[PDB]
Design a protein around this ligand. Sequence first.
Ligand SMILES: Nc1nc2c(ncn2[C@@H]2O[C@H](COP(=O)(O)OP(=O)(O)O)[C@@H](O)[C@H]2O)c(=O)[nH]1
Ligand SMILES: [Mg+2]
Length: 180
Amino acid sequence: AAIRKKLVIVGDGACGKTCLLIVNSKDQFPEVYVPTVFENYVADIEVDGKQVELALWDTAGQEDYDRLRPLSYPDTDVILMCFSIDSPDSLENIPEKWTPEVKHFCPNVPIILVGNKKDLRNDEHTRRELAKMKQEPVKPEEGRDMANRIGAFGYMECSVKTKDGVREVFEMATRAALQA
Ligand SMILES: Nc1nc2c(ncn2[C@@H]2O[C@H](COP(=O)(O)OP(=O)(O)O)[C@@H](O)[C@H]2O)c(=O)[nH]1
Ligand SMILES: [Mg+2]
């Protein structure tokens, strides 16, 4: 049968985690807001002639969920660790919060660092809202640097809005999950 692997997605609230999982649904998603996918979603990825089924586990990044979140970690095969390119704060929390949490609960599990919302890097409204506080969108080189700092298997940028990069995120996650 297909190889069975578990993926968990983590990162600050609002950085696009749930949308990144939902893009792998064959069904049109209804016009509702869900903090976390609460049904059993699976990504069917073929890599190197191998059929893999990736169980996708969503999490809530907010501090109030810190005690419940580790219940999602048992037997994880790959982590998608997300920040948003429109949120320098979300990148700052990668080494400060997400990296030590997942290394504790998921020792030796490969991490794919994902910069979501790539479409906002050049977005005029985003640039203005960050610029007013003397900030700017995350640059690709900052994501690469952070992947090195945290020991990630890779760094990828994607936009669920435009779909650019989404395929590579799940293909890389699958290749990472297959290494163990
Ligand atoms: N511009 C843009 N917005 C996005 C993208 N992905 C998600 N969003 C928006 O970001 C908000 C948070 O997304 P969500 O998946 O709920 O984030 P989560 O809290 O990390 O699960 C939602 O309003 C989405 O519409 C993206 O790639 N580009
Ligand atoms: Mg969510």
